[PDB]
Amino acid sequence: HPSHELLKENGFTQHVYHKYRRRCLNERKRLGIGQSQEMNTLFRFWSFFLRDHFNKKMYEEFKQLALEDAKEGYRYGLECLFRYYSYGLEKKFRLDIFKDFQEETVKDYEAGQLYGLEKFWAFLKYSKANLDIDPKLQEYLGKFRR
Amino acid sequence: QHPSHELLKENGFTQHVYHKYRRRCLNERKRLGIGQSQEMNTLFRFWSFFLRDHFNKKMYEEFKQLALEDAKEGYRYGLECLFRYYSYGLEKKFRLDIFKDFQEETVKDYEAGQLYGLEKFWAFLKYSKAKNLDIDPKLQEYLGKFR
């Protein structure tokens, strides 16, 4: 499966990927949001690949599509994105993505979900790291733990 | 202070304290609407933890009913708590009837287009020492494509 060849050490080619991505996005369109298991492989691919091989362009598309699916009630993409945030920022902290992590966690919370908040809390527990947390987010974390 | 904490202590559970806490959470759900109640979310989490070592059939059935009602409206916390109760709880103390429920809810979750339940079922199979598991034929198909 291209999903896996591409994650092997130096096994990524921008040719295999383009074909694979094009194919997944087409099944999503053909079958409907949340209906393509192949699209789900791409969400998983992005979640893992971006941790070691950050590509701003891939990342932006990852987030945009995860959120579109989530708006219609299909969580897997967004669940994959929160795992990217939590596990990736642990290994290689970076400030912009951490800011995005906070913003998407707040949005997830205000939409009545807790998946994102638990991932954020878990990140802080395992984080080695001077963190400045959004006031709203500290507030939400406090309530969650009661 | 919050009843959730007290009820989970060793020997901390009483019917009276639980009844008032449950009533309160359900009242907030009825007032704010499905998935709009943070108190209800603490109750889902309580159930998920408490039922592992203090299984109660009537409590479990209400947990499952409310989790599925909420998930229908798109609010998934209750069901996520239920799947964690299934995945972790059955590894610790296997119950055949609950395992059959776990299979049923996983198949439903997958056919509704989610993978949270399937991943938790997968994780249970990876860690369980139970032998001779009879797993739903369609669920085996789904597990196959998944991992």
UniProtKB/Swiss-Prot annotation, chain B:
Subcellular locations according to the entry: Cytoplasm; Cytoplasmic granule
Induction remark: Up-regulated in a number of hepatocellular carcinoma cell lines and liver cancer lesions, as well as in patients with hepatocellular carcinoma with a lower survival rate (at protein level).
Region named Interaction with mRNA:
1-147
Query: How is it modified post-translationally?
Result: Phosphorylated on multiple Ser and Thr residues in response to active mTORC1. Phosphorylation is important for interaction with RPTOR and the mTORC1 complex. Phosphorylation promotes dissociation from the 5'UTR of mRNA molecules with a 5'TOP motif.
List the residue ranges of the region (Interaction with 7-methylguanosine mRNA cap structure). 84-127
Q: Signal peptide span per the entry?
A: none
Q: Tell me where in this chain the PTM N6-acetyllysine is found.
A: 20, 145
Role played: RNA-binding protein that regulates the translation of specific target mRNA species downstream of the mTORC1 complex, in function of growth signals and nutrient availability. Interacts on the one hand with the 3' poly-A tails that are present in all mRNA molecules, and on the other hand with the 7-methylguanosine cap structure of mRNAs containing a 5' terminal oligopyrimidine (5'TOP) motif, which is present in mRNAs encoding ribosomal proteins and several components of the translation machinery.
Complex formation: Interacts with PABPC1/PABP. Interacts with EIF4A1. Interacts with RPTOR. Recruited to the active mTORC1 complex via interaction with RPTOR. Inhibition of mTORC1 activity strongly reduces interaction with RPTOR and the mTORC1 complex. Identified in a complex with mRNA, PABPC1, EIF4E and EIF4G1. Found in a complex with PABPC1 and SHFL.
Q: Which family does it belong to?
A: Belongs to the LARP family.
| Record note on domains | The C-terminal region mediates interaction with the mRNA and polysomes. It is required for translational repression of mRNAs with a 5'TOP motif. The N-terminal region mediates interaction with PABPC1.
Protein's UniProt name: La-related protein 1
What's the source species for this entry? Homo sapiens
Please name the gene that encodes this protein: LARP1
